[PDB]
Amino acid sequence: MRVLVINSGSSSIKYQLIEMEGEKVLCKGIAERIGIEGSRLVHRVGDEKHVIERELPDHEEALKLILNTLVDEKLGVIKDLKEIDAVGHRVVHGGERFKESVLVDEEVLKAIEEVSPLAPLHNPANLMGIKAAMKLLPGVPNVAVFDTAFHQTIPQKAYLYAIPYEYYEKYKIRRYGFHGTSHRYVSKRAAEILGKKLEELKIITCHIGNGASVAAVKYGKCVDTSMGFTPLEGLVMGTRSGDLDPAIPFFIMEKEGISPQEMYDILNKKSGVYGLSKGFSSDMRDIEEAALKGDEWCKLVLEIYDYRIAKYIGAYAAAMNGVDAIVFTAGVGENSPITREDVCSYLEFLGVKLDKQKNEETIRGKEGIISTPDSRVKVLVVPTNEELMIARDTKEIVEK
Amino acid sequence: MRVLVINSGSSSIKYQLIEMEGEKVLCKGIAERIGIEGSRLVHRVGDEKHVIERELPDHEEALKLILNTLVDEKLGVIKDLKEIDAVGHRVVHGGERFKESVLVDEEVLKAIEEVSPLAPLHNPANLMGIKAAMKLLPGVPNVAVFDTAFHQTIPQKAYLYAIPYEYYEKYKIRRYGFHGTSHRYVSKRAAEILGKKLEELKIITCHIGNGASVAAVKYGKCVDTSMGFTPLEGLVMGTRSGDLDPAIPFFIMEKEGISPQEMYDILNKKSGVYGLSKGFSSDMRDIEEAALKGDEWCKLVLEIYDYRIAKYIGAYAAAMNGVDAIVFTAGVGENSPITREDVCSYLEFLGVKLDKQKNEETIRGKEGIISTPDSRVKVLVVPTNEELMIARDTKEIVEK
């Protein structure tokens, strides 16, 4: 069966065409700079990278160009458009309604719009992708997979903020969490690698990239996650501040004559790794490189970054009353043996020991266990594949 | 030697007169409603509680009334005012300058004012108490003991927020932490009870009262604390929101047409326990009582409250790479066997087991160990005595 996996953000649509049976990526790419000048499609078919220049005023005309070139028999991969058996969409916010992936009909579509104000910068462009896909591929089923859904199992004690309850009643302000379908993917994948059922494992998953969150996955259900009502909460991120003292923003606004918009922006665009390094970079490996070159200041940014991750592992261990395994994934989790090592140094009191050899080996996309045989808590690097996860939910639903 | 211990807040001075040698409270009390109508002094000498009605326009005239009645030979306790050998003051904020308690001279006094803008609601009234004490008791040494000082050992990785570093350079925005001299008192007291040197213990101290913070006390030095730049960060408090998603305030302000002042207030006066219980109470035992009576909603507030404490213990355990002991103290920590039990249920993965009998016994001011003999992490209830701690620093400094 052939699933087309779509992820439409405000400026772009990026796609993979997966063959379920072989679970093989037939091709992938990105339609970039939609709405802006010099929009284009970057299309990869194995080794080859093809660049197509063209005006793409919106997501529909963009998805058209994608579909056309899936079939164009020079840069193509399938004979017909009938070859696409189903389409799977990443939708950022599902709210409290959507507990798991769903087949999209009018009902679902209306229900997604209703949730859209809870992620105004993301959901609109997801829907744009869905509506465009249903239009250009009539009859082909679409499945929505929600970034927030994996986290819907989180108990009340964990998703209510210590703020007037009216704010939840009235605006549904709670912890929703994000990177759901990634935490779900790697937690499940880790259990398979350990040769054990997911329902008898307490796993802490660390999705650490340009954006980062941790998830506490107790017996297969998520019990807590680092991100909150929005993606600002929790770990240090590329440009996001993570956790801070509720009072700071108010102080900064007042001492500097800054509207809440101007401050929210600063917390969101100019903070985190970028903020800490005085505007050096937001890319964590730019700092890793500079720290290894002897730059004193980066060694600190690195330590700050790692420290907070370590504390979250500790915190969530407490939340589940145990850890059986810890999983690193995403851009940094998969590629920084140093970060993995620093974070784990805080954790030997739990019985965590790394195998230096294995740690340095599992880099650039490889996957495996990094804890020593004797280590009481298992540590794994499981490169995330959120797209495949979508394709798999689409596959299951569509078979019916 | 006789130390007069003072704690001057904006509206009141509260005092204890301690006899170092016996470490006996000769008398204590409070001068209330200074500046407001019907100001008064409540004065306790053992069993007796004496109420004196009088206008007290400011802290000086208030301290005068205190000093007078320390000597009045009906409600008094000392023959002369010469009997007071030293005076110890609680000063909320010490900033980065003051690492430990200091003998007050002009230099110190000026240096405290310089730090005052970092706690505008507290420091001013502390100084008022110092200046009044130096005036009315010329020649008698005054010692300042700083709520932030114990926390000055916290490393950089732990006190810098993931915000533009400029904000620290320019305004000294970092984690300072509070309840310093309480975390210091109980961590030290716990080590004594265990018959072990403080420098070979990893202690997590939980000051849980109307304000609440946790401290990570690694080998006698504090390495992290829950409160931040201000007392808003961390645990759920009586009326304070504790930790929340940086973004929430901005959302609430914008959806409701509320100035940052109006929002900061809501987070500070109407949130936490009060906020969660829809305005029922901010006193945690009011909720404990109602939860035990079968009220479903309070059981939840209780669970939320406890949960976050438990997570902090877990987090800080990770920070120190171990826990040797956990200490409960302050209003709730000392008096809620239920909270202590709930919090510890999350911690058996660390080897924490409570003795139900001992837990329920150590109530209303008693102190002792609550972990079972076999428990791998020791748990103690150590009623806090911040005043005695001040008297002891005053004693040491003054002997010289």
Side-chain angles (χ1 to χ4, degrees):
Chain A
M1 190 220 284
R2 284 167 174 158
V3 185
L4 172 71
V5 181
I6 276 166
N7 176 208
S8 37
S10 55
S11 216
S12 75
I13 302 167
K14 61 178 85 160
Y15 64 89
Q16 297 194 358
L17 191 55
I18 308 169
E19 209 274 327
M20 298 297 103
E21 306 208 351
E23 273 196 359
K24 277 177 195 162
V25 165
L26 269 32
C27 71
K28 70 186 184 212
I30 185 170
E32 257 175 349
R33 299 188 190 111
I34 304 164
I36 313 174
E37 196 148 16
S39 40
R40 55 165 188 181
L41 168 93
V42 163
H43 180 210
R44 293 149 183 283
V45 183
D47 296 3
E48 305 170 10
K49 175 163 93 192
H50 306 273
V51 155
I52 307 188
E53 310 267 44
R54 182 185 289 186
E55 272 175 278
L56 304 171
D58 72 355
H59 290 76
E60 182 181 326
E61 285 321 309
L63 184 55
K64 198 158 179 164
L65 180 67
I66 295 161
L67 292 171
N68 288 308
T69 52
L70 282 188
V71 157
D72 173 62
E73 48 183 75
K74 259 195 175 167
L75 327 155
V77 135
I78 42 169
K79 308 200 169 180
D80 289 39
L81 280 177
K82 215 177 198 149
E83 299 273 57
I84 299 159
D85 283 295
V87 183
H89 299 269
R90 182 187 182 145
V91 172
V92 164
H93 213 305
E96 277 181 338
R97 294 149 193 262
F98 293 112
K99 319 255 110 144
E100 63 193 6
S101 316
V102 188
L103 163 69
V104 181
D105 57 344
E106 289 312 349
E107 288 286 0
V108 164
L109 217 60
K110 190 164 71 161
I112 289 178
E113 292 185 335
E114 278 173 40
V115 168
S116 289
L118 294 188
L121 287 189
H122 301 275
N123 270 24
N126 303 336
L127 283 167
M128 286 188 75
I130 297 173
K131 293 189 223 222
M134 307 189 321
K135 179 171 171 193
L136 304 159
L137 298 184
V140 184
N142 302 77
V143 165
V145 190
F146 303 96
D147 264 334
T148 66
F150 183 50
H151 303 308
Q152 278 303 294
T153 43
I154 289 165
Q156 287 201 264
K157 67 183 174 188
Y159 72 70
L160 288 176
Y161 292 105
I163 58 173
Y165 187 64
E166 291 80 358
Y167 288 130
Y168 168 82
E169 279 169 354
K170 191 171 178 172
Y171 303 95
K172 294 283 172 182
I173 293 171
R174 75 201 256 336
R175 169 180 313 280
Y176 289 106
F178 300 91
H179 299 144
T181 101
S182 189
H183 290 293
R184 177 155 147 264
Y185 174 66
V186 302
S187 55
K188 172 157 188 189
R189 183 80 186 93
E192 277 157 34
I193 294 170
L194 298 164
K196 280 173 187 173
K197 273 181 179 172
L198 188 48
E199 317 79 57
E200 57 193 35
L201 284 184
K202 295 182 201 192
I203 305 158
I204 294 172
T205 59
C206 300
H207 183 276
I208 296 150
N210 197 220
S213 69
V214 173
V217 187
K218 183 190 198 190
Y219 304 139
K221 307 188 170 174
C222 181
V223 161
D224 211 338
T225 180
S226 107
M227 288 186 177
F229 181 67
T230 67
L232 265 99
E233 203 174 316
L235 307 177
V236 175
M237 298 157 215
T239 57
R240 301 199 204 83
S241 77
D243 293 311
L244 62 57
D245 188 332
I248 288 163
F250 296 94
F251 181 87
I252 303 180
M253 289 170 71
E254 213 218 44
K255 295 292 168 204
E256 286 206 311
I258 290 191
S259 66
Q261 188 67 250
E262 305 193 60
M263 174 63 38
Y264 175 80
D265 283 0
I266 288 164
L267 287 182
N268 207 223
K269 304 180 165 187
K270 273 169 137 183
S271 302
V273 161
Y274 180 99
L276 287 164
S277 57
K278 309 174 209 173
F280 181 62
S281 180
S282 67
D283 191 358
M284 259 304 298
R285 49 216 181 112
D286 268 353
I287 281 154
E288 184 155 327
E289 162 161 30
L292 283 157
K293 287 178 178 204
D295 176 277
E296 283 310 318
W297 193 248
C298 286
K299 270 177 207 180
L300 190 70
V301 190
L302 186 40
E303 277 192 358
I304 282 158
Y305 192 84
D306 299 333
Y307 182 60
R308 213 192 280 182
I309 294 158
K311 280 168 59 184
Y312 265 100
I313 302 161
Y316 286 165
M320 290 149 86
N321 190 32
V323 206
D324 291 308
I326 301 161
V327 188
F328 291 104
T329 194
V332 173
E334 304 167 16
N335 299 298
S336 174
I338 295 165
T339 285
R340 290 196 298 247
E341 194 270 1
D342 194 50
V343 169
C344 287
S345 69
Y346 293 90
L347 303 180
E348 63 193 89
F349 78 106
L350 286 182
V352 178
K353 288 180 188 171
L354 259 42
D355 183 8
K356 293 180 180 295
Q357 319 176 153
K358 273 180 197 162
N359 190 192
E360 294 173 7
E361 264 180 16
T362 28
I363 183 165
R364 300 190 180 180
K366 274 185 161 182
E367 98 172 332
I369 297 169
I370 1 159
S371 49
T372 61
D374 53 272
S375 173
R376 284 157 78 269
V377 173
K378 315 245 133 158
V379 182
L380 309 96
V381 181
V382 177
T384 184
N385 188 348
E386 294 170 68
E387 288 77 11
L388 179 66
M389 180 48 93
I390 289 167
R392 281 184 185 160
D393 279 24
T394 310
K395 168 147 178 277
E396 289 196 340
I397 300 167
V398 160
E399 294 160 344
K400 230 132 206 181
Chain B
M1 191 220 285
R2 284 166 176 159
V3 185
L4 171 72
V5 182
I6 277 165
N7 177 207
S8 39
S10 52
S11 209
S12 71
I13 304 165
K14 63 178 82 163
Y15 63 89
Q16 297 190 54
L17 191 55
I18 308 169
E19 209 274 327
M20 298 297 103
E21 306 208 351
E23 273 196 359
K24 277 177 195 162
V25 165
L26 269 31
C27 70
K28 69 185 185 213
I30 186 171
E32 257 175 349
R33 300 187 190 110
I34 302 166
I36 312 176
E37 196 146 16
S39 39
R40 55 164 188 183
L41 168 92
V42 164
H43 181 209
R44 294 150 181 281
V45 184
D47 295 3
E48 305 169 10
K49 175 163 93 194
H50 307 273
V51 156
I52 307 188
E53 310 267 45
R54 183 183 289 186
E55 272 175 278
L56 303 171
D58 72 354
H59 291 76
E60 181 181 326
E61 284 323 307
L63 184 55
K64 198 157 179 165
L65 180 68
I66 296 161
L67 292 172
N68 288 307
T69 51
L70 282 187
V71 157
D72 173 62
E73 47 183 75
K74 258 196 174 167
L75 328 156
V77 134
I78 43 169
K79 308 199 168 181
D80 289 38
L81 281 176
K82 214 177 199 148
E83 298 273 57
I84 299 159
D85 283 296
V87 184
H89 298 270
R90 184 189 183 147
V91 172
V92 163
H93 213 305
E96 278 178 338
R97 295 150 192 264
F98 293 112
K99 317 257 110 145
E100 64 193 6
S101 316
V102 190
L103 164 70
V104 181
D105 56 344
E106 290 311 351
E107 289 286 359
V108 165
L109 216 60
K110 190 163 72 162
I112 288 180
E113 291 186 334
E114 280 174 40
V115 169
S116 290
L118 292 188
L121 288 188
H122 303 276
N123 269 23
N126 301 336
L127 284 167
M128 287 188 77
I130 297 174
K131 293 189 222 222
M134 307 190 321
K135 180 171 169 192
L136 304 160
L137 297 183
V140 185
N142 302 79
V143 166
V145 190
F146 303 95
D147 263 336
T148 66
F150 182 49
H151 302 309
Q152 279 301 295
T153 44
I154 290 165
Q156 287 201 264
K157 67 181 173 189
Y159 72 71
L160 288 177
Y161 292 103
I163 59 175
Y165 187 65
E166 290 81 356
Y167 287 130
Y168 168 81
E169 280 169 355
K170 191 169 178 172
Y171 303 95
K172 294 283 168 184
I173 294 172
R174 75 201 255 336
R175 170 179 314 279
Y176 290 105
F178 300 89
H179 298 142
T181 98
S182 188
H183 290 292
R184 177 155 147 264
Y185 173 65
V186 303
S187 58
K188 173 156 186 190
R189 183 80 185 94
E192 278 156 33
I193 294 169
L194 299 163
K196 280 173 187 173
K197 274 181 178 172
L198 188 47
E199 317 78 57
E200 58 192 35
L201 283 184
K202 293 182 202 191
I203 305 157
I204 293 172
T205 61
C206 305
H207 184 274
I208 295 154
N210 191 238
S213 68
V214 179
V217 186
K218 183 191 197 190
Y219 304 139
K221 307 187 172 174
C222 182
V223 163
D224 211 335
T225 181
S226 108
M227 290 186 176
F229 182 67
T230 68
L232 265 98
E233 203 174 315
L235 305 178
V236 175
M237 298 157 213
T239 58
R240 299 199 207 83
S241 78
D243 294 312
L244 62 57
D245 187 330
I248 287 162
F250 296 94
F251 182 84
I252 303 179
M253 290 172 67
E254 214 217 45
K255 294 293 167 205
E256 286 207 310
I258 289 190
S259 68
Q261 188 68 248
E262 305 193 59
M263 183 65 75
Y264 174 81
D265 283 356
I266 289 164
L267 288 183
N268 207 223
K269 305 179 164 188
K270 274 170 135 182
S271 302
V273 161
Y274 180 99
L276 285 162
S277 60
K278 312 174 207 173
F280 181 62
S281 181
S282 68
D283 192 359
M284 259 303 299
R285 49 215 180 114
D286 268 353
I287 280 156
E288 185 154 329
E289 163 159 33
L292 283 158
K293 286 179 177 204
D295 177 276
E296 283 311 320
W297 192 249
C298 283
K299 269 175 209 184
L300 190 68
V301 188
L302 188 38
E303 276 192 0
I304 280 156
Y305 192 86
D306 300 333
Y307 182 60
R308 212 191 280 184
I309 291 157
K311 282 171 58 185
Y312 265 99
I313 300 160
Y316 286 166
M320 292 147 89
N321 189 33
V323 204
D324 291 308
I326 300 162
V327 188
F328 290 105
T329 195
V332 173
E334 303 167 15
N335 299 298
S336 175
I338 294 166
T339 285
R340 289 196 299 246
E341 194 271 358
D342 195 50
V343 170
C344 287
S345 68
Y346 294 89
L347 303 180
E348 63 193 90
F349 79 105
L350 286 183
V352 178
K353 289 180 186 173
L354 259 42
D355 182 7
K356 293 180 180 295
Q357 319 175 153
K358 272 180 198 162
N359 190 193
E360 294 174 8
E361 263 180 16
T362 29
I363 183 165
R364 293 180 180 275
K366 274 184 162 181
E367 97 173 332
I369 297 169
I370 1 160
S371 50
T372 61
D374 53 274
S375 173
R376 284 157 78 270
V377 173
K378 317 240 132 159
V379 182
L380 309 94
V381 181
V382 176
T384 185
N385 188 346
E386 294 171 68
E387 289 78 11
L388 179 66
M389 182 47 94
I390 290 168
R392 281 186 186 158
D393 279 25
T394 309
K395 168 147 178 276
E396 289 196 339
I397 299 167
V398 158
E399 294 161 345
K400 230 132 206 180

